[PDB]
Amino acid sequence: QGPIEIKETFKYINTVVSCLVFVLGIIGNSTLLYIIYKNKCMRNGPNILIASLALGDLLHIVIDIPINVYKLLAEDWPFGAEMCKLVPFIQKASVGITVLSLCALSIDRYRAVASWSVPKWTAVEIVLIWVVSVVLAVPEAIGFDIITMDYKGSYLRICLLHPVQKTAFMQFYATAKDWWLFSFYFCLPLAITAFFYTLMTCEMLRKNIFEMLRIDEGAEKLFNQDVDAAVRGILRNAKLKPVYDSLDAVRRAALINMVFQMGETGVAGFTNSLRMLQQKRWDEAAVNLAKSRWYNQTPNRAKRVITTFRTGTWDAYLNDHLKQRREVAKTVFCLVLVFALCWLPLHLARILKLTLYNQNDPNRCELLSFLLVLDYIGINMASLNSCANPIALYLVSKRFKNAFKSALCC
Numbered sequence: 277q278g279p280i281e282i283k284e285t286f287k288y289i290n291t292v293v294s295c296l297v298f299v300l301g302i303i304g305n306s307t308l309l310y311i312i313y314k315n316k317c318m319r320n321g322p323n324i325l326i327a328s329l330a331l332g333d334l335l336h337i338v339i340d341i342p343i344n345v346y347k348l349l350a351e352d353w354p355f356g357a358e359m360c361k362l363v364p365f366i367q368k369a370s371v372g373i374t375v376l377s378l379c380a381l382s383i384d385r386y387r388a389v390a391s392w393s394v395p396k397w398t399a400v401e402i403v404l405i406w407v408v409s410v411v412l413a414v415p416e417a418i419g420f421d422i423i424t425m426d427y428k429g430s431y432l433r434i435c436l437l438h439p440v441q442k443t444a445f446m447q448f449y450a451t452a453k454d455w456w457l458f459s460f461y462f463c464l465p466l467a468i469t470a471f472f473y474t475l476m477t478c479e480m481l482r483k484n485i486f487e488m489l490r491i492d493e494g495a496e497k498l499f500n501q502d503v504d505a506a507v508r509g510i511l512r513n514a515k516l517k518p519v520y521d522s523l524d525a526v527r528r529a530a531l532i533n534m535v536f537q538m539g540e541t542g543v544a545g546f547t548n549s550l551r552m553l554q555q556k557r558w559d560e561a562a563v564n565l566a567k568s569r570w571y572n573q574t575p576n577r578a579k580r581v582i583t584t585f586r587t588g589t590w591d592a593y594l595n596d597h598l599k600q601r602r603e604v605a606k607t608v609f610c611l612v613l614v615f616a617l618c619w620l621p622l623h624l625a626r627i628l629k630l631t632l633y634n635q636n637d638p639n640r641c642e643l644l645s646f647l648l649v650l651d652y653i654g655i656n657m658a659s660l661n662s663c664a665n666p667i668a669l670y671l672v673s674k675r676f677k678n679a680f681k682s683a684l685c686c
């Protein structure tokens with residue numbers, strides 16, 4: 277049958293995945309804690325939050341993974357009542373540390389670019405993350421216990437959190453647990469990190485346009501309302517509106533740059549160049565713009581604007597301080613994205629089972645086999661997330677990649 281065939285297959289798959297996560301995660305997160313400790317240049321707010329997150333994932337890896345490997349392979353629980361109050365507690369405490377750290381990471385990225393304006397603040401965050409994650413994981417250590425069954429010369433030890441619990445709170449917890457796990461440990465971080473991501477990019481966008489105009493125009497705080505009025509007029513002009521809509525945020529700022537210098541009527545005169553921008557022919561747009569009277573009178577500014585068009589980034593206008601903040605923000609929301617994709621299949625599987633289990637035998641069989649396969653994939657991706665950040669940091673962050681190579685290769 278599907279259920280017995282599927283569980284046997286994933287006995288092999290999960291054992292290899294969990295052995296991979298154990299080895300990769302022990303090496304990766306230990307090295308991650310090493311490079312943040314040894315490299316004094318690496319000690320900053322976001323990195324220290326990444327360190328606690330790596331310590332939390334290391335705790336789950338060394339405490340829970342070897343047991344979870346055996347648990348999957350044997351029907352009996354031999355590790356005692358203590359280990360099975362501990363393993364689910366560590367599992368929810370560690371994931372909670374990741375969940376709250378990721379939220380603190382995304383809020384810190386917003387505050388970094390925030391218009392309103394702190395080393396002690398990261399220390400308060402660290403305490404709050406671990407205290408709150410551990411408190412919210414305590415009901416796991418409360419509800420879970422061993423059930424021993426003996427019938428006809430055969431005994432079995434299962435550790436479970438029974439749907440029926442002693443106290444009112446533990447009863448409510450056991451019943452609400454599945455939705456609680458979905459809400460706080462998936463919906464809460466994804467919503468908060470997305471909310472502060474979008475606010476951050478908007479604020480980073482204004483800071484970049486402001487910096488661009490500061491370099492090109494050359495002490496005016498009216499730049500922001502001036503920009504807003506400028507895009508209003510660009511949306512007013514039938515010659516400038518179509519190309520402006522086609523452009524991304526960065527190239528729209530390059531168009532605004534030309535509008536600041538020449539006005540809307542002057543920018544409209546580049547009908548051929550504007551068309552080619554709308555066609556997304558950046559290099560052709562760069563060349564035709566380069567052979568212009570605007571280029572001739574102001575080549576330095578023309579060079580930067582046409583490079584901004586062609587490139588689509590802020591390279592020509594971004595200072596060292598702002599290039600630092602974009603790489604850090606890119607690192608933070610890479611980990612956020614990695615968390616979402618790793619925890620998406622499992623939370624999807626649990627919610628589909630929670631919502632679509634009609635208990636009719638005909639519909640159940642095929643839906644069960646699919647949901648079971650999805651659940652197994654889900655817990656594999658979640659295990660991978662506990663070892664994925666060292667690899668992710670290596671690939672997405674030039675600083676982390678160099679720190680890893682210094683610590684490991686030579």
Ligand SMILES: Cc1cc(C)cc(C(=O)N(C)[C@H](Cc2ccc(-c3ccccc3)cc2)C(=O)N[C@@H](Cc2c[nH]c3ccccc23)C(=O)O)c1
Nearest residue numbers: 333336344363364367370371374457461655658659661662
């Ligand atoms: C928030 C949350 C939500 C859901 C739906 C499941 C888990 C969970 O707890 N899982 C997915 C573990 C395995 C695991 C735990 C933590 C990480 C982790 C930690 C830090 C950073 C990133 C990832 C990765 C995998 C799991 O296998 N849970 C089992 C229950 C279970 C496994 N071993 C046990 C021992 C005793 C009692 C229960 C268990 C299940 O949900 O099916 C956690």
Ligand SMILES: CCCCCCCC/C=C\CCCCCCCC(=O)OC[C@H](O)CO
Nearest residue numbers: 309324325327328329331332335402403406
């Ligand atoms: C690196 C950021 C700090 C992350 C950890 C904060 C929470 C520690 C409390 C319980 C953990 C129990 C497991 C033991 C781990 C020991 C961690 C530790 O001793 O760190 C003290 C201090 O940061 C060294 O200078």
Ligand SMILES: CCCCCCCC/C=C\CCCCCCCC(=O)OC[C@H](O)CO
Nearest residue numbers: 376404405408412443444445446448449460
């Ligand atoms: C940064 C900080 C983030 C912290 C985020 C935490 C949010 C969820 C925490 C607690 C909700 C608890 C809900 C409690 C409902 C229990 C039901 C109940 O109390 O049952 C009655 C019983 O008689 C009484 O003991």
Ligand SMILES: CCCCCCCC/C=C\CCCCCCCC(=O)OC[C@H](O)CO
Nearest residue numbers: 448451452453455456457459460464630631
């Ligand atoms: C500072 C604030 C931080 C954020 C704090 C709030 C985060 C989300 C908390 C609770 C929502 C999920 C609670 C789950 C309640 C489920 C109710 C229930 O028992 O439903 C059983 C249902 O019948 C089975 O299908």
Ligand SMILES: CCCCCCCC/C=C\CCCCCCCC(=O)OC[C@H](O)CO
Nearest residue numbers: 466469470473606609610612613614616617
């Ligand atoms: C296996 C995982 C592979 C993952 C590969 C990741 C590569 C991304 C790197 C940099 C782009 C950063 C983009 C950040 C986008 C914002 C993330 C976010 O806010 O997530 C909200 C959540 O999706 C609710 O909708």
Ligand SMILES: CCCCCCCC/C=C\CCCCCCCC(=O)OC[C@H](O)CO
Nearest residue numbers: 610614660663664667668671672673674677
């Ligand atoms: C088995 C392990 C499970 C995890 C598997 C991998 C998880 C995340 C991997 C990649 C995320 C995106 C990395 C690629 C980002 C592309 C942009 C980039 O690399 O730019 C920075 C670079 O240093 C130039 O300066």
